[PDB]
Amino acid sequence: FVNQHLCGSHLVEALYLVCXERXFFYTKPT
Amino acid sequence: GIVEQCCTSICSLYQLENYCN
């Protein structure tokens, strides 16, 4: 992977996949 | 945070992999 700009639930849909068990947390409202 | 890196730059599942908890 060298190019896959993702935003909204899409950008996390990738995070939700990378983990899929730990329950990552998008720090957007940080 | 990463919004400007995953929404503007490239979001590699490897870099965001450190966003687990």
Curated annotation (Swiss-Prot), chain B:
Disulfide bonds join 6-11. This is Insulin A chain. The chain holds residues 90 to 110 of 110 of the full protein.
